[PDB]
Amino acid sequence: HHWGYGKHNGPEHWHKDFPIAKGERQSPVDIDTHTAKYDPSLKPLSVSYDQATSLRILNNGHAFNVEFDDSQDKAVLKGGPLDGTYRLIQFHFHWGSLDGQGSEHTVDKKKYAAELHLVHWNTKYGDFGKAVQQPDGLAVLGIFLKVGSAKPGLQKVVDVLDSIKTKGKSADFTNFDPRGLLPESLDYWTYPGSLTTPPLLECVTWIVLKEPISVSSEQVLKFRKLNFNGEGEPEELMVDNWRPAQPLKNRQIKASFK
């Protein structure tokens, strides 16, 4: 049936319907800090989210996405290893059933409690659908979440989760500022990869921030109360919706710092 994160339809089965799962540039990967190459020609990241217009938050059965209006250059990502402008279309998280797991990428094999993905698409391609048919169509900003103190900027997201408990449910979510989810430093690692969920298209330039943000135990607890199932079906808690790290193969992870 449809792919999932369970025993019978999880990551290890995806290859059957999406053969690209065993490709050459799959994500996520483990970031070996001692092997990453400091590249002094990498420009600083430019995050312009001052004009961001959030619209809706939705539970799609795999995670919850906060969608933005990408009809024009309102919230964009430029600089870093990117060429051209990339528009923010949505952000979502991957998290675990326990605090010691949840992130997709790992640093020196270390797993974080969750990982935030800010999905952007290259404006040169006209629309998101075209962008996903190109090796440089997407840019995803990956941010790690570690359990500690509450992140004020995340609370609005946490408060609306009750409204979208089950698959298919959505709630209007305007005036949310994504800048409140950013760590203080924009230092990062970057490597060419893919979507971490089917169809696993290899169209992504991954930019993983070095500094993680802190969220309270109660904040991530609320993520865990979401459901994979739709209303009226047997309850399956939405936890551990992350894909294990893939082989790096012939790729180099570059760092923007030393």
Contacts with ligand F6B by CB under 6 A lie at: 117, 119, 132, 140, 195-197, 199, 201
Looking at beta carbons only, is 28 or 173 nearer to ligand F6B? 28
Q: How far is the CB of 241 from ligand F6B (least distance, A)?
A: 9
Q: How far is the CB of 138 from Hg ion (least distance, A)?
A: 8
Give the Cα-Cα-Cα angle 149, 95, 168 (nearest 5 degrees): 120
Looking at beta carbons only, is 107 or 119 nearer to ligand F6B? 119
Does 120 engage in binding with Zn ion (CB under 5 A)?
A: no
Does 117 engage in binding with Zn ion (CB under 5 A)?
A: yes
Q: Using CB under 5 A, which residues numbered 41 to 100 contact Hg ion?
A: none
The answer to the question of whether 94 is labelled as a binding residue is yes
CA distance 31 to 189: 8
Q: How far is the CB of 8 from ligand F6B (least distance, A)?
A: 21
Looking at beta carbons only, is 26 or 227 nearer to ligand F6B? 26
Exactly one of 13, 62, 105, 120 is catalytic; name it.
Answer: 62
- From the list 21, 107, 203, 209, which residue makes contact with Hg ion (rule: CB under 5 A)? 203
Looking at beta carbons only, is 124 or 150 nearer to ligand F6B? 124
Assess whether 34 carries a catalytic annotation: no
Size of the site for Zn ion (CB under 5 A): 1
Active site residues: 62
